[PDB]
């Protein structure tokens with residue numbers, strides 16, 4: 001079912017169905033690392049975690065990080081036999097493409113080379129960005145994990161005016177649910193579940209099945225498998241508590257929740273799988 | 275890149291040049307947007323990455339098709355469907371005789387169909403002007419040049435300010451609104467609608483303040499009743515002169531009653547009240563061009 005209200009600018013069922021049909025064009029494979037026998041699932045987590053730190057340093061949006069994550073996973077599904085030293089180049093080039101797509105004033109190319117501490121030249125990044133975009137058939141507009149959370153938070157706080165395009169919801173609980181998703185995205189097994197299911201399951205853990213279904217459209221049976229998998233990650237966040245909303249220099253406070261943050265999530269990811 | 279023979283240069287922008295080309299085997303003509311990557315310090319331009327990814331998911335009869343993306347010799351070739359004229363030159367060629375009213379209606383109907391498709395796919399065009407609307411020899415008109423376009427989220431966040439060419443720029447942009455979405459494209463289309471009718475630009479300003487005052491002199495100086503929140507906008511001033519709204523029988527003399535009504539709703543000041551592309555298609559101005567489909571109520 002569709003959780004969107006009536007839309008003045010289109011058939012609500014049409015918009016939602018385009019969004020749903022989008023997730024059929026955009027395939028993911030939780031086992032794509034079997035195409036690269038020399039890689040481990042932990043290397044992906046360390047790379048993604050590094051990209052998250054890079055985003056916070058340059059105050060890049062959460063959407064930019066998750067585009068880079070999605071570009072990375074989908075590009076790997078098209079490739080074979082990749083080694084450790086090529087990972088930092090593929091990641092940072094994914095982030096380069098992502099920043100150019102999403103930021104009003106993205107960082108320059110040499111800054112993306114600068115953060116690799118010289119392991120990636122600007123010319124290497126430009127070569128890699130073309131390889132990535134060509135191998136992805138220039139399909140560079142997925143509905144990221146975090147984009148679904150954005151939808152779910154609007155619907156949860158829909159007034160009677162039913163205005164769905166002007167953002168309105170507490171920034172504090174948004175960044176708390178994003179924190180659970182940032183952890184789960186480090187585990188490659190998350191790709192078993194569609195991005196919209198992943199975001200709805202994180203929201204459920206911070207509220208209820210009734211709110212989850214109201215704002216996501218999915219029934220409890222659709223997300224039960226995801227929720228049971230997210231179980232260890234959710235409790236790790238609960239044991240340590242949730243983070244506070246930050247202020248960023250030069251960032252309007254009504255956009256402050258949209259900036260990617262970084263925390264020591266790798267040790268918390270290790271405090272699971274048991 | 276071998277079967278294509280460049281035939282004529284047709285355009286030039288910041289990141290590339292557009293050529294008409296012709297396949298020597300099939301006789302098929304296309305438009306080539308060439309991007310020399312050797313000159314680009316930031317790699318593939320953001321505007322090119324955006325346009326390609328957007329158009330690969332926007333397949334519609336009233337949107338100029340992206341056919342192929344070819345990378346060769348430090349260059350990037352975007353291969354497009356070819357159309358032989360833009361609406362700007364068609365309006366100038368028609369300036370003495372006028373575009374016939376059934377053709378204005380058909381062109382506007384098609385433009386609203388293409389815009390409605392963009393908006394349902396959560397894409398803003400943000401640069402609708404007659405030079406970006408292409409026509410063929412079979413009565414079709416199509417949206418083109420998506421280099422300034424942007425996908426919007428549900429809900430949106432703050433996007434690039436001061437978008438849209440000046441004459442077609444909505445008043446909420448000129449007044450510095452923090453958020454915007456689909457209403458900016460409808461305003462541009464309403465400006466273009468009136469321009470087809472009068473063969474003159476509706477609001478030909480030479481600065482941001484001159485543009486806003488040209489709008490005010492025609493549609494009246496807006497206030498809180500007609501546009502809630504207008505007096506709280508960053509570029510609003512209490513010192514704006516008070517002009518009275520002009521009768522549309524003088525703004526668009528040739529337009530009949532249904533046309534005047536549709537134009538008024540496309541030029542509503544309040545972006546929340548401005549008619550949507552989908553609703554405009556249902557307007558009685560097109561009641562003869564289209565018939566409604568039955569609607570399930572479930």
Ligand SMILES: C[C@@H](NC(=O)O[C@@H]1CC[C@H](c2cc(NC(=O)c3cnccn3)n[nH]2)C1)C1CC1
Nearest residue numbers: 285305338354355356357358359360406418419
């Ligand atoms: C320069 C263009 N920039 C752009 O981005 O256009 C897209 C890429 C190329 C596509 C295209 C252009 C075209 N023909 C003409 O423009 C033309 C031909 N003869 C006379 C007058 N005009 N057919 N198809 C769409 C703007 C017109 C939109």
